Ligand binder design. Structure first.
Ligand SMILES: *[C@@H]1O[C@H](CO)[C@@H](O[C@@H]2O[C@H](CO)[C@@H](O[C@@H]3O[C@H](CO)[C@@H](O)[C@H](O[C@H]4O[C@H](CO)[C@@H](O)[C@H](O)[C@@H]4O)[C@@H]3O)[C@H](O)[C@H]2NC(C)=O)[C@H](O)[C@H]1NC(C)=O
Ligand SMILES: *[C@@H]1O[C@H](CO)[C@@H](O[C@@H]2O[C@H](CO)[C@@H](O[C@@H]3O[C@H](CO)[C@@H](O)[C@H](O[C@H]4O[C@H](CO)[C@@H](O)[C@H](O)[C@@H]4O)[C@@H]3O)[C@H](O)[C@H]2NC(C)=O)[C@H](O)[C@H]1NC(C)=O
Ligand SMILES: *[C@@H]1O[C@H](CO)[C@@H](O)[C@H](O)[C@H]1NC(C)=O
Ligand SMILES: *[C@@H]1O[C@H](CO)[C@@H](O)[C@H](O)[C@H]1NC(C)=O
Ligand SMILES: *[C@@H]1O[C@H](CO)[C@@H](O)[C@H](O)[C@H]1NC(C)=O
Ligand SMILES: *[C@@H]1O[C@H](CO)[C@@H](O)[C@H](O)[C@H]1NC(C)=O
Ligand SMILES: *[C@@H]1O[C@H](CO)[C@@H](O)[C@H](O)[C@H]1NC(C)=O
Ligand SMILES: *[C@@H]1O[C@H](CO)[C@@H](O)[C@H](O)[C@H]1NC(C)=O
Ligand SMILES: *[C@@H]1O[C@H](CO)[C@@H](O)[C@H](O)[C@H]1NC(C)=O
Ligand SMILES: *[C@@H]1O[C@H](CO)[C@@H](O)[C@H](O)[C@H]1NC(C)=O
Ligand SMILES: *[C@@H]1O[C@H](CO)[C@@H](O)[C@H](O)[C@H]1NC(C)=O
Ligand SMILES: *[C@@H]1O[C@H](CO)[C@@H](O)[C@H](O)[C@H]1NC(C)=O
Ligand SMILES: *[C@@H]1O[C@H](CO)[C@@H](O)[C@H](O)[C@H]1NC(C)=O
Ligand SMILES: *[C@@H]1O[C@H](CO)[C@@H](O)[C@H](O)[C@H]1NC(C)=O
Ligand SMILES: *[C@@H]1O[C@H](CO)[C@@H](O)[C@H](O)[C@H]1NC(C)=O
Ligand SMILES: *[C@@H]1O[C@H](CO)[C@@H](O)[C@H](O)[C@H]1NC(C)=O
Ligand SMILES: *[C@@H]1O[C@H](CO)[C@@H](O)[C@H](O)[C@H]1NC(C)=O
Ligand SMILES: *[C@@H]1O[C@H](CO)[C@@H](O)[C@H](O)[C@H]1NC(C)=O
Ligand SMILES: *[C@@H]1O[C@H](CO)[C@@H](O)[C@H](O)[C@H]1NC(C)=O
Ligand SMILES: *[C@@H]1O[C@H](CO)[C@@H](O)[C@H](O)[C@H]1NC(C)=O
Lengths: 129, 436, 437, 129, 436, 127
């Protein structure tokens, strides 16, 4: 299936991440003569494009572009999940996960942007002797 | 814990409830056919999701709001380019039609002075009218709509015959469906699957009795957002349909007159046969058995051995007191009081006909429906009912239900019941053992 | 010597002047319904440290955008309303003589005519009241003043045009620079600036001669002009504190709804309840004298002390030029401000007239009919500025006269837009470095 | 803080590139018939997307795709500037510095493009050992 | 030892149908539609060693030009004053004074009762009419189009004068032109180049004879989708142009009549001086030489020693039996028979004037041309014509060619024969001597 | 020029792929009143964007995103075309080639996706 049930073993589910991304992109007078109908459909297309681009831009700025699973250089903070690792991969369910970490969503992202910035900053001086 | 790092994933198959517009798809001169250009998928792919329990709320289902809005919009779009009938808001001179009288005051023979192609002349012409469209001026009559609002003639070449419509999600969205045969109005059902487009639903409009919809797979189901609240309506889904045979048996012809430069008006001319009243035939035994099944289910919420009564509705406009039909473009208002005439513990329904139609209880924007030539037969499958529960009952042993009615989103609420729309959210995080 | 290499940077905080669209946002009313998307309760204004820039309010395209968009919505509001073309008839008229004061000398006119009834076959004889300004004589027969020029559309009685603060917001990729530097000239460099995503909301107030319900003017009377030496240009004056003005329509009117052929209704002015009085506005004379004294000091700042400063108390042009304009309650007032300008520097009641058929700014191809307002009207406004023109070209440098009027809503909207400029962000920058691939 | 530190030192300003860049991507149904209002707004969304994509394409072609800060094998010309590194990319701001080389926008881009083109050609010949 | 290489930005294309936008050089209707300025220096890129197939008979740009022209024409007229109030009985007599021997009652003098600004007032006016637009009832006449459709008057301030308009490709598309010589209009050619925009083509409207177009590379070119199909139009592109001088000799008056509030009608007033008929002058020798050139080429297609007759077209609606054109804003219907009266092996063509027309030969919409004051004239370049074959039998000995055309898309087809638009397809694949 | 050398041999034509790629992305108030026309033009812009992005996404899927010319690990089958490289690179026009093997487009794309999916999965076992 296109989406799995996402109940456990997301590591296997990961084999489909490619299709999920692929399907994000894809009458004449039948619609052209109709002003409201035509504008609603264009609005839908545009917003779909914007969603696509925001996700890709974030992966880029965080240094995760091109990967489906990205290991970062930002440590896990205890506040995010006080639960130990054993429960997260199998005991937790990804949708259930997302509810609990709603509050620490932006902070995860700011740290990722900053660490990527620091890495590129440092690259400049590896080239400069 | 000391070795955990942030990891981020993309394309994760999870979602949140969301609203977005849907695309209209079809198959196979027809408004809906022209609108719903996109063809359906001959092979939709239903994905069963095993570890899913999900809460559905048909009563907070946004799909209903869109279907309603879009239908009223298409109705107007199809009427926009048609000939306006303002010139007919004149004194009308009427007499009774006694010519081949049936003895079943419904039909009048009326005349008026209409402008010819030149502005300098008007011609006296005549046509036939139904009393439901004509009101007396204290032989002097006026059309009813002219009392409050403008009217436009429906185009004679434009069809509104229902075509099942499948609504399809935009990329990034998915339509989820509840497959639980006993699913009630709200709740976390365990039979959940994902589809790209809905099952097609014909845009059938009726009041009181729901025609050509879906049947319950197992048993008749009674659904409501709040069944104990008498302010809410009750929707009933049947497991078996009941066939109903309807007719407008009078063989007549139509006239066409010139109002102006390329402006034509079509109207009922003489009946070219004798005259008899319109009606619907419901099998008697089937109806009584069907109702008994409903009663068995009502007892679940109203008491194991309570007294259940069916009665005629309160009065009001025909749109809420009779059964509304649209057969070939003609509108009927059938008397269904005999279908609700019993207490539990070949039925002929006479039908009224009218040509001035209001849509979705919106005050103006009246429409005129030119007649069908010859006669018309209409056959349909009843799939459900709208019932209203009486309030004010202090005697707990008796509960009375009457035919209900109201806004047409709710016919669609029933057909769209099993559907929900969500947005897919591809990013997420987890702790990991790996690091850069 | 160092052989520096080309480095590419993305997200560089620089900009260039630019023109784009504007999103409109508010916090039945026309502006309120169209500006659906809410504003930011607390815009995160960014002070720009060690940044200066230039502003030029006379070249600010937002003035044109505000103007174009408002007129567009104005027309949109009228698009679905009933037309009054059936009212262009011969009117049989006499002037109301019942309980009328000394000033209202035939100003209120009583007319009757044969109008179309619900069925187009019949006519109804009706009568209604009119203001003299909108009715003209044929060759006791009268016609509506605009029967020759254009169709009149009745405004929908349920729709409000009360000004509300609408904020203009930048599209992504754009920024609005605001000038904070106090007492800014309008054309020079500004050395105290900040960045916002949305401007201060501006109420779309429409007036003539005086500017109503604007800003504090940087706590000083300030006089700005595109060209100070060109007497043909408008002078925009902002005041240190407002002058309160109390306006009334001292007549208890009847709204008389009449059904016409179409399912639509016409709103006639019905009979007057009680006596008939002239509309007027009350201005504190002391406040007004002090206000002008401050304006006069600023005029000396620009032109010298060795002159005499006079204001005109008359002007040419039509009613939309010669009188002050108010639209309180949707009632259109044309107030005589000549009494405010006797001047000649080294309370006061201004009578007002009422008109119902309204022409439109910078157009003549249409007309609108303002339904009558039942009851009486009272409002209070803040006079925050003036539009003045000097009656210059004279060789008599000893004196000069500053005439009120010459208004154009674009100039009136320039006021309160002048503080903002639109630029676009250009994230790509290049510079030399120590390092290469 | 979107355009914050616009007046800061050019070198220091590199630390705010993540913010300036990420922010570039950012009853309503009753306005669907308000055709001009609605079309202008939709066009603005589309046009913003087009600008974004043109800059991203240029980066991909020039090389250093996905980076916030990068450099190439193109020397700085004496016609662009004759200034010390201690006063360029330091001790001044970007608004004024950018004005100083505005002539050369196009030549620089052309040079960036040709260099990357030649490098990729050579990479394929190196791969084909 | 080869593996797949993926390349991006590769120079290939496929034929495609897309939407083109217009540009101009700078209150003309064409002008206000092309807000995009042209490129002062178009860049024609020669394509070394590209052979390409063009087909004018299947060129979608013809349809694009057509749709935009018809649509624009109507858009221009949408805001102009409607003439419904003038569809009244006319009281008519002949104009008899100051008329020369040729205009034998074509000019009519009519009067009628019409509206004024106040509903309570009426006015009586008179105006002049051409016979072609007025029909007798059963002294009493009416405007011809009163039964069929609304007639509007074109705005006197709006110019429909043709401007050469350039069509430009959207990004991702390019316009390929055949710059070869005397190209057939079908099949391959070897001189191919591309442009960003086409040259400007004036939206010339004409019927039997083609004005202000191509000079056919100094040779007569005979073009046809199917040259042996007698029923197809044969497009003739001439070697050199033939000058034609057209005039409307009468000195006219423009009478302004009030209709209503901001509503004006422009009527024809009295003619000053003698009343004469419209006509066009064609150089006789030039035209006779021109036909001989055409015949030489026709023989190449139909037989080397056969007889070619040129003759008058068949009858039908005026708009398709004449060399119709718009000159000064006036509508001329010039007689063709004197232009086609010879057998192979200065002349004057009289013209009719009409004001109410069916633009683009559509029925259901009508427009009334305004009066023009003074006299008018123009000079045009005959660059081509459309002919059909009579056939009816097979006879290698002889054939007859008569004027055809009238479908505006063919005028446009002719000018557009030089080019097509293609979609650029930048992604492609080929093998290489390596892998990752 | 932009499609200059379109008729040339592909071995040389490929040198200007960057030029062509860049160019793929290139009374206004009067035009705002053209309610149908404005939609046709806006659709053209939107459609062009979607096509561009679609192709770029495919490169990401197949790998080599950001590159102008790149080879994958999918072998040439020799059934698509059994023509040799001397002929392909020196004598054939890039356009002629594109036409000759147009059948096999879908086959190749499916193969490209699978090879890229496999490589990422394999990279993970190192850690
Ligand atoms: C400068 O700003 C001032 C702000 O005070 C503004 O004057 C105000 O105008 C509003 C709108 O006309 C007045 O609002 C009224 O308040 C009374 C309170 O008793 C209400 O009863 C009125 O109700 C009627 O009108 C409503 C219109 O929406 C109807 O919905 C309702 O059913 C009634 O018919 C109405 O709300 C307000 O009172 C005045 N302020 C003062 C002190 O009088 C002024 O107009 C602005 N100047 C300019 C040039 O814009
Ligand atoms: C083939 O090309 C020829 C040559 O261009 C073309 O004939 C020309 O047509 C135009 C438009 O009808 C003529 O333009 C006129 O020029 C005179 C100059 O004295 C003006 O006075 C005329 O009108 C004025 O008044 C109008 C009042 O309503 C204004 O609206 C207008 O702007 C002017 O002020 C008008 O401009 C031109 O003179 C002729 N050329 C010749 C030699 O007569 C011919 O029609 C083209 N044929 C085809 C099929 O395209
Ligand atoms: C109908 O008309 C026929 C004559 O054509 C007549 O014999 C018959 O009785 C009429 N029917 C009624 C109900 O009057
Ligand atoms: C005439 O019409 C009235 C009203 O419908 C009805 O009551 C009456 O019986 C009719 N008369 C005849 C002869 O049918
Ligand atoms: C038609 O007009 C005549 C006057 O010419 C009038 O007497 C008659 O009543 C009118 N009839 C109708 C049906 O309106
Ligand atoms: C449906 O039934 C469940 C129990 O199975 C209950 O929790 C839920 O509230 C019900 N929903 C409705 C329609 O009230
Ligand atoms: C259901 O209706 C009862 C009245 O019968 C009311 O008291 C209760 O609050 C309602 N519950 C919900 C969820 O609407
Ligand atoms: C209801 O049943 C009774 C049985 O006596 C019958 O008389 C009555 O007519 C019925 N009513 C309806 C509406 O069928
Ligand atoms: C109208 O006003 C004039 C004053 O100009 C007066 O002379 C005239 O008598 C008035 N009309 C009446 C009511 O007679
Ligand atoms: C209404 O029409 C009659 C027609 O006889 C005329 O005498 C009267 O003056 C008209 N009334 C008005 C107010 O114009
Ligand atoms: C301030 O405005 C005046 C009047 O137009 C002008 O002459 C002067 O140069 C302006 N000041 C600056 C700094 O531009
Ligand atoms: C307006 O009326 C109020 C009544 O309370 C008064 O206090 C105020 O001073 C008046 N303002 C003017 C300008 O007359
Ligand atoms: C006018 O007087 C002020 C003092 O208030 C003085 O500062 C200014 O310079 C004077 N201006 C002239 C024209 O002398
Ligand atoms: C402005 O200049 C001061 C030194 O005078 C410096 O300390 C401060 O950081 C500068 N501001 C910015 C934004 O760089
Ligand atoms: C292509 O055209 C050029 C034109 O100069 C010619 O030299 C060349 O031989 C042709 N063929 C190829 C393969 O380049
Ligand atoms: C105008 O109307 C009068 C009405 O008395 C009639 O006699 C006259 O003939 C009409 N004239 C025309 C030209 O229709
Ligand atoms: C030129 O067009 C005619 C049209 O029927 C066709 O028969 C002929 O083959 C064409 N010439 C070439 C070279 O294709
Ligand atoms: C003129 O026409 C005649 C046929 O009527 C023809 O024989 C003669 O050759 C023509 N002259 C020229 C120059 O073509
Ligand atoms: C054709 O030529 C003949 C020559 O006898 C002449 O009589 C006839 O009138 C001419 N017809 C036309 C249309 O010129
Ligand atoms: C590609 O090679 C396989 C064998 O590995 C063969 O089965 C397949 O048919 C070939 N493809 C084509 C297009 O012939």
């Amino acid at each position: 299936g296109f989406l799995g049930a996402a109940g456990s073993t997301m590591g296997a589910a990961s084999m489909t991440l490619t299709v999920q991304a692929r399907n994000l992109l894809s009458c004449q007078q039948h619609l052209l003569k109709l002003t409201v109908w035509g504008i609603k459909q264009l609005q839908a297309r545009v917003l779909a494009v914007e969603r696509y681009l925001r996700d890709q831009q974030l992966l880029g700025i965080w240094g995760c572009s091109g990967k489906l699973i990205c290991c970062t250089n930002v440590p896990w903070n205890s506040t995010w999940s006080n639960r130990n690792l054993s429960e997260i991969w199998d005991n937790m369910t990804w949708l259930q996960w997302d509810k609990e970490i709603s509050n620490y969503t932006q902070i995860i992202y700011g740290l990722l942007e900053e660490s990527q910035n620091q890495q590129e900053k440092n690259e400049q001086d590896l080239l400069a002797l | 814990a000391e070795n955990l790092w942030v990891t981020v994933y993309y394309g994760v198959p999870v979602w949140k409830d969301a609203e977005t517009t849907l695309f209209c798809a079809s198959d196979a001169h027809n408004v809906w056919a022209t609108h719903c250009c996109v063809p359906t998928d001959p092979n939709p792919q239903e994905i069963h999701l095993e570890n899913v329990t999900e809460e559905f709320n048909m009563w907070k289902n946004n799909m209903v709001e869109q279907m309603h809005t879009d239908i009223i919009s298409l109705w107007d779009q199809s009427l926009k380019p048609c000939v306006k009938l303002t010139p007919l808001c004149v004194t009308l001179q009427c007499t009774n039609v006694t010519n081949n009288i049936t003895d079943d005051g419904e039909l009048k023979n009326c005349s008026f002075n209409m402008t010819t192609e030149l502005r300098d002349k008007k011609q006296k012409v005549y046509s036939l009218f139904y009393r439901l469209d004509v009101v007396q001026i204290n032989k002097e009559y006026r059309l009813i709509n002219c009392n409050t609002s403008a009217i436009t003639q429906a185009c004679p070449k434009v069809s509104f015959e229902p075509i099942p419509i499948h609504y399809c999600a935009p990329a990034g969205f998915a339509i989820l469906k509840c497959k639980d045969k006993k699913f009630n109005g709200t709740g976390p059902c365990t039979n959940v699957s994902t589809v790209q487009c809905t099952h097609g639903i014909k845009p059938v409009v009726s009041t009181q009795l729901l025609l050509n919809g879906s049947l319950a797979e197992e048993e008749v189901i009674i659904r409501s957002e709040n069944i104990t609240n008498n302010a809410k309506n009750i929707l009933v889904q049947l497991n078996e349909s009941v066939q109903i045979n309807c007719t407008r048996p009078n063989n007549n012809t139509r006239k066409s007159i010139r109002i102006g430069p390329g402006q034509w008006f079509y109207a009922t001319g003489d009946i070219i046969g004798d005259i008899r009243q319109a009606h619907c035939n419901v099998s008697k035994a089937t109806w009584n058995e069907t109702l008994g099944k409903v009663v068995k289910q009502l007892r679940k919420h109203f008491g194991n051995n309570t007294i259940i009564r069916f009665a005629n509705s309160s009065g009001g406009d025909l749109e809420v007191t009779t059964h509304s039909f649209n057969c070939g473009g003609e509108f009927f208002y059938c008397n269904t009081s005999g279908l609700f005439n019993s207490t539990w513990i070949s039925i002929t329904l006479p039908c009224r006909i009218k040509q001035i139609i209001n849509m979705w209880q919106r005050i103006g924007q009246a429409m005129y429906a030119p007649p069908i030539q010859g006669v018309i037969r209409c056959v349909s499958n009843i799939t459900g009912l709208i019932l209203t529960r009486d309030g004010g009952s202090t005697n707990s042993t008796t509960e009375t239900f009457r035919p209900g009615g109201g806004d047409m989103r709710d016919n669609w609420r029933s057909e769209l019941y099993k559907y929900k729309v969500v947005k897919i959210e591809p990013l997420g995080v987890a702790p990991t053992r790996c690091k850069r």
